[PDB]
């Protein structure tokens, strides 16, 4: 892939504004004039609008603080399942987690009944009948929330730890916990009632190239204070 930026006003220069995807568009309208005169013109449309809500930065920050508070009162375990063990991925990830007042631990085998973040390898490498660590340690423990990551994504281009990945992993953990307990933990807004949610789901079989083949559809709804799946 090769791409060109949309707009650029760096240092208020008119030469850099001429080399974008909205600078060429200005030239295009100046070439239809010098070959056709005013015979042909192109006019654009403005969508009507009266309700436009700018979002500040403080509201997002305060949202994420309360996001992490709920995750604080739980147990978090990190495990490593690579074949040729190397790198301090567990230590680095634990450092990143503990910078947010969330305290976790390191285990050699996953624990049952606690949130687990696992470190695994590339999926293609393991053989077909090889018992993938992830698949095995999932199917046996069927009442436990899981997460996984590759060890290469915790280091940036220059070698420093990547914070962003840590925040993403924690937020996703909370989302699955919310699904498992069937009751919301943080304050979401309210939505239309007496409605049912349906989602089609494509089969994961490689033979599922049929266009019209029927798909399973899954349904969710809310009764009382409990979601039903």
């Amino acid at each position: 892939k090769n791409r060109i930026q949309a707009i650029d006003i760096t240092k208020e220069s008119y030469s850099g504004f001429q080399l974008s995807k909205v600078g060429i568009l200005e030239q295009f309208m100046q070439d239809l004039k010098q070959a056709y005169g005013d015979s042909v013109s192109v006019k654009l449309q403005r969508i009507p609008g009266e309700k436009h809500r700018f979002v500040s930065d403080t509201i997002v920050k305060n949202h994420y603080v309360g996001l992490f508070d709920a995750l604080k009162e739980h147990r978090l375990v990190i495990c490593d399942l690579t074949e040729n063990q190397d790198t301090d991925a567990a230590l680095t990830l634990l450092h990143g987690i503990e910078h947010l007042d969330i305290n976790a631990e390191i285990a050699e085998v996953p624990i049952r009944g606690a949130l687990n973040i696992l470190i695994v390898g590339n999926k293609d490498t393991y053989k077909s009948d090889e018992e993938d660590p992830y698949q095995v340690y999932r199917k046996k423990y069927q009442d436990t929330v899981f997460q996984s990551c590759y060890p290469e994504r915790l280091w940036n281009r220059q070698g420093q730890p990547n914070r962003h990945v840590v925040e993403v992993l924690l937020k996703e953990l909370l989302i699955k916990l919310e699904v498992h307990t069937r009751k919301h933990l943080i304050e979401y807004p309210s939505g239309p009632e007496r409605c049912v949610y349906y989602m089609p789901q494509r089969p994961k079989d490689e033979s599922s190239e049929v266009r019209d083949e029927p798909w399973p559809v899954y349904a969710s709804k809310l009764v009382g204070d409990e979601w039903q799946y």
Partner: protein, 1134 residues
């Protein structure tokens, strides 16, 4: 040059004068040298010496006659390399030599000579020239080797007549051995290698007593020597030890009056070799065992004092399997903790192997000196004459043949003399009781890998640096040589681009001569006489140029008027991508802006631009642009211009440098030249002859007197950029570059520009693979960098101008990155040039800058370094004192430190021997710190940065009330034990004030109060040393009695298994024992504690250990006579 060559001539005459006075004796001649770094300079200096001998007049009449001149010119010789030496001798000389030694019968020599001569006859094009050089070298080697062997002991052909002339032409170094000549001209690289005579190769660095050395460009040589020290060879440390251990068990020397006192020097080495065999099971091979250990090699780095770095993740271990019959390197338990290693360590093996290997190469030199002593005067049975330079190879081959060790011949030859030439200097010991410094210790790098072919064994390669360039320069002075170094920046304050003059002011002393203030003012007066600007009207104009983008924007548009934008023109028609755009804009703007000012001014003709990169064909696209601009600005004003691109060192010696002068004194116009900082460092004399018909009126002379010869002028406009990469790098190989980088890091840590924390981090990232850019970033945060930049600016302006004829307007344009650095100059402007003062003054007039003196930073860093070394060395010493057998050197070293601290707790001047025990504090008598003495040494902080920490001073040892006892004071006064702290700026480090001073202070106070009332003291029988203080005997008492001390009310958490283990070990061999635990300087009001074998206090009578609270109270230093009486009662019939 005039002064130096005159200095040479005066000595040439003094030797003649001495020769005519002294038959009443007989001695040798004095050797005089003239060394530099370039071949051209050597040749030119020789030519000037001969010219001075010819054209020198006194009272308007020659000082010498024609016949006298020949004698003087017959004593100067020039020594080139071998390849050039062969290509000057003609066919007649070589044919005569070959016939004289009967080498024409052989087939190989004649065939080789035919090829050499045949190529010589058709050497016109630069294709057979390259081959001719390489073949000439090899032929020279073989011919000289055979000549030497034929002259060795027999069939020595007698040299006289034409044969002598032929040989001396082919071998100039012969003319010195017989005594014909005593003046030599040679380069630095050839001076460190030596030259050839008939007998053997002569090494100038092995005999320097009574020799005068003239070195030009003294500061540059620091680099040259370094490049020679990084080209050494590696060595396997397993093969060496197994080859030394096997050959030092049965082989013996001879009992003759020529081998006296040589068999007593190899005995300790023989003793240590066997111990290193039994401890590590050197009868088996080595191999690794485990994953992640067979994938990558293992690298270890040691500084031999305190800095150690490893390339692994967890500590590695060594084992010995008696069933598989092999030694295995295993990673052991990689989890956190879990039974810390009790098998062995790889690091210990490497470090101990090195000491033995260098212990064998230092004993041989001593042996050879002793051999010469016995063979010159105690035998004199066959006359051989000659000195230690002659009995060099015989004394080596004799010992090597006797000991069946013939593979170490080369390694002995590289570093050998009476003692050293590539091995340490100064104190010659790594211990607290010796002077320690980096410049005579070096560094070690070790790699472990698989052997070639075999898939079951591993080897350990090692590379070493044994001496810094400064140490070599100092040893030359201590040998007895006189060194005269001439330069303009010979005393800069840089340690990377110049020697370390602080190390040379502590080791040399009063042998480092210096000029006085009166002499400096005399030189200043001379300089102002020959160059006077406060008359005739000469002015210097300075301007600083910033970056201008609007200036370049319009110019690019005019260059290609049919384009659209500026970035597109720069990217497309010129050849730079988007990454390299800001930097390009930056320099080009300033360059063109300076050129405009040059062209506008009427009375200027010549301009030189100094950049950091070559403007050659590779940058053709940019060149055209610049050219175009000039033409436009030539039409705006009224003057014609000419430009010269591609000025390289290759261009200088292929096209020449005399064309600019021709174009200047034959045609009118202006000239612009493009050059770099390094290119205009090997091409000198940038002068052009003048012609007043072409020039105008601005050639005012500045000399107070008239000037001779032709009329010449110089540069009148200069552009200065800011220098580029200033960190040294090698190109010989990979290991050479690594050694270079480690050398520089350790040098900066030595002087005081870097803290131990930063230095260790930098070393670690060097080991794991590092980019150049990060290294330069680390370099730029030090004060050495600014000194280097200033040095280059000074040199650049100094070389621009060599005549007494100047214009009335001299223009200097400077980049806008040098302003702050130049404003920071604070030295004495007594011997400065004229342009440099203008630069400094112009920069200094803008605002003001807070200056944090380098001294203040240096004190903090050096305090940290000394404190860091103390801890590690003490731990190593005590651990070596807990081995089952205790040695004798160790107990001596243990005694000396305490005795020295007690006698001199605070010195005044700079200590020389015990140097890493004293730190310099800003206040005089006390200092405050805060840290932990059982954790990370790189966490300490001192002085004002910690105003609430612990204090090191005289009041915290209670020495006032310590010596106020009546039975303690006489003992202190007799043995010269100071009872006060002289207020000077040297106190002991916080490691030697809590674990050394405190103990030894109270321990000997025990030996006064106990000894006055009977009791007798003794010494530990070499088996329980440092586990107990002393042994006491009184009135014939059985069950030998041991004691121990803890100075004041100091408590230690060893009441657990440690104390019980001590008691158990003592009693298991010596039998029943009694123990006296006592303190001092405490509260003498507590009862006596009679502890049993454990800490379950039993009845008074059935006890084994007595604990006394105190004997001398801190109130007014009384004596607890009740405690002494009870102690006598318990240790009696009972």
């Amino acid at each position: 040059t005039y002064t130096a060559l005159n200095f040479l001539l005066q000595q040439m005459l003094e030797q003649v004068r001495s020769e005519l006075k002294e038959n009443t004796g007989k001695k040798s001649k004095r050797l005089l040298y003239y060394v530099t770094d370039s071949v051209d300079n050597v040749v030119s200096a020789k030519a000037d010496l001969l010219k001075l001998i010819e054209k020198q007049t006194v009272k308007g009449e020659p000082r010498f006659t024609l016949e006298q001149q020949e004698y003087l010119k017959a004593q100067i010789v020039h020594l080139p390399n071998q390849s050039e030496q062969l290509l000057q001798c003609s066919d007649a000389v070589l044919n005569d030599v070959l016939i004289g030694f009967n080498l024409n019968a052989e087939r190989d020599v004649q065939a080789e000579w035919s090829a050499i001569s045949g190529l010589r006859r058709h050497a016109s094009n630069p294709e057979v020239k390259i081959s001719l050089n390489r073949q000439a070298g090899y032929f020279y080697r073989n011919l000289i080797d055979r000549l030497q062997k034929k002259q060795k002991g027999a069939d020595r052909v007698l040299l006289s007549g034409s044969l002598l002339a032929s040989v001396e032409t082919l071998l100039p170094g012969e003319k010195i051995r017989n005594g014909s000549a005593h003046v030599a001209f040679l380069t630095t690289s050839k001076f460190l290698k030596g030259f050839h005579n008939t007998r053997s190769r002569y090494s100038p660095l092995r005999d320097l007593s009574g020799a005068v050395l003239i070195i030009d460009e003294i500061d540059k040589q620091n680099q040259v020597i370094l490049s020679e020290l990084c080209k050494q060879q590696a060595q396997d440390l397993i093969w060496a030890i197994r080859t030394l251990r096997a050959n030092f068990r049965d082989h013996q020397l001879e009992s003759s009056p020529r081998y006296d006192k040589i068999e007593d020097l190899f005995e300790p080495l023989r003793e240590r070799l066997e111990e290193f065999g039994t401890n590590w099971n050197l009868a088996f091979a080595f191999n690794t065992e485990g994953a992640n250990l067979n994938e990558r090699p293992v690298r270890l780095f040691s500084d031999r004092s305190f800095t150690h770095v490893s390339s692994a993740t967890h500590k590695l271990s060594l084992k010995s399997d008696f069933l598989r019959r092999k030694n295995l390197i295993f990673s052991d338990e990689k989890v956190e903790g879990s039974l810390i290693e009790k098998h062995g360590l790889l690091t210990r093996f490497v470090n101990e192997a090195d000491v033995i290997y260098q212990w064998f190469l230092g004993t041989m030199r001593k042996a050879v000196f002793q051999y010469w002593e016995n063979v010159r005067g105690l035998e004199i049975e066959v006359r051989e004459n000659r000195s230690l330079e002659g009995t060099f190879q015989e004394a080596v081959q004799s010992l090597l043949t006797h000991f069946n060790l013939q593979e170490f011949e080369s390694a002995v030859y590289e570093s050998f003399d009476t003692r050293g030439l590539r091995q340490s200097a100064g104190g010659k010991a790594n211990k607290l009781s010796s002077s320690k410094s980096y410049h005579h210790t070096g560094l070690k790098l070790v790699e472990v890998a698989h052997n070639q072919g075999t898939r079951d064994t591993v080897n350990c390669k090692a590379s070493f640096l044994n001496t810094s360039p400064s140490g070599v320069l100092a040893d030359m002075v201590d040998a007895g040589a006189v060194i005269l170094g001439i330069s303009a920046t010979a005393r800069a304050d840089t340690v990377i681009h110049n020697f370390d003059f602080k190390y040379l002011n502590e080791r040399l002393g009063n042998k480092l001569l210096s000029l006085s203030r009166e002499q400096k003012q005399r030189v200043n007066n001379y300089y102002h006489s020959r160059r006077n600007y406060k008359d005739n009207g000469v002015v210097l104009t300075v301007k600083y140029l910033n970056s201008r983008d609007a200036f370049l924007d319009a110019l690019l548009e005019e260059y290609k008027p049919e384009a659209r934008s500026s970035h597109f023109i720069l990217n497309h028609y010129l050849g730079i991508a988007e990454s390299e755009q800001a930097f390009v804009r930056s320099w080009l703007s300033k360059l063109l802006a300076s050129i405009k000012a040059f062209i506008s001014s009427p009375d200027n003709r010549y301009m030189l631009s100094l950049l950091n990169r070559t403007l050659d064909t590779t940058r053709q696209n940019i060149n055209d642009f610049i050219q175009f601009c000039c033409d436009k600005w030539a039409k705006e004003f009224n003057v014609k211009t000419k430009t010269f691109f591609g000025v390289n060192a290759d261009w200088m010696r292929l096209v020449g440098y005399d064309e600019i002068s021709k174009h200047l004194n034959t045609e009118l116009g202006k000239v612009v030249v493009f050059s770099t900082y390094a290119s205009m460092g090997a091409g000198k004399n940038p002068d052009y002859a003048v012609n007043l018909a072409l020039e105008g009126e601005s050639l005012i002379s500045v000399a107070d007197v008239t000037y001779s010869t032709q009329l010449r002028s110089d540069i009148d406009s200069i552009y200065l950029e800011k220098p580029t990469q200033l960190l040294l790098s090698d190109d010989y190989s990979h290991t050479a570059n690594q050694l270079c980088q480690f050398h520089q890091i350790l040098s900066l840590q030595e002087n005081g520009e870097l803290s131990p924390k930063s230095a260790e981090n930098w070393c670690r990232q060097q080991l794991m693979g590092m980019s150049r850019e990060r290294s330069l970033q680390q370099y730029h945060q030090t004060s050495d960098y600014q000194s280097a930049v200033r040095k280059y600016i000074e040199q650049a302006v100094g070389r621009a101008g060599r005549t007494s004829l100047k214009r009335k307007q001299i223009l200097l344009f400077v980049d806008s990155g040098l302003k702050e650095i130049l404003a920071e100059e604070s030295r004495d402007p007594s011997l400065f040039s004229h342009e440099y003062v203008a630069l400094v003054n112009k920069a200094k007039s803008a605002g003001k800058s807070i200056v944090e003196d380098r001294a203040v930073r240096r004190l903090f860093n050096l305090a940290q370094r000394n404190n860091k070394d103390g801890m590690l060395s003490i731990k190593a010493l005590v651990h070596r004192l807990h081995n089952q057998p205790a040695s004798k050197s160790d107990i001596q070293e243990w005694q000396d430190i305490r005795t020295q601290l007690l006698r001199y707790p605070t010195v005044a001047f700079q200590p020389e021997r015990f140097n890493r025990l004293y730190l310099q504090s800003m206040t005089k008598g006390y200092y405050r710190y805060q840290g932990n003495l059982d954790g990370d040494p790189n966490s300490f902080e001192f002085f004002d940065r910690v105003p609430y920490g612990d204090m090191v001073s005289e009041e915290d040892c209670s020495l006032a009330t310590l010596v106020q006892n009546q039975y303690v004071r006489p003992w202190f006064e007799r043995k010269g034990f100071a009872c006060s702290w002289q207020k000077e700026a040297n106190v002991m480090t916080p490691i030697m004030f809590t674990n050394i001073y405190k103990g030894a202070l109270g321990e000997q106070a025990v030996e006064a109060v106990l000894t006055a009332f009977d009791f007798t003291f003794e010494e530990v029988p070499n088996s329980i040393y440092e586990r107990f203080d002393n042994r006491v005997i009184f009135a014939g008492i059985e069950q030998p009695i041991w004691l121990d001390s803890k100075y004041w009310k100091h408590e230690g958490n060893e009441s657990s298994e440690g104390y019980s283990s001590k008691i158990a070990l003592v009693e298991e061999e010596f039998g029943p024992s009694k123990f006296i635990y006592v303190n001092a300087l405490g509260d003498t009001s507590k009862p006596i504690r009679y502890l049993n074998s454990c800490f379950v206090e039993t009845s008074p009578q059935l006890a084994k250990v007595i604990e006394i609270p105190a004997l001398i109270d801190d109130s007014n230093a009384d004596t607890n006579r009740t405690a002494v009486q009870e102690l006598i009662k318990w240790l009696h019939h009972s």
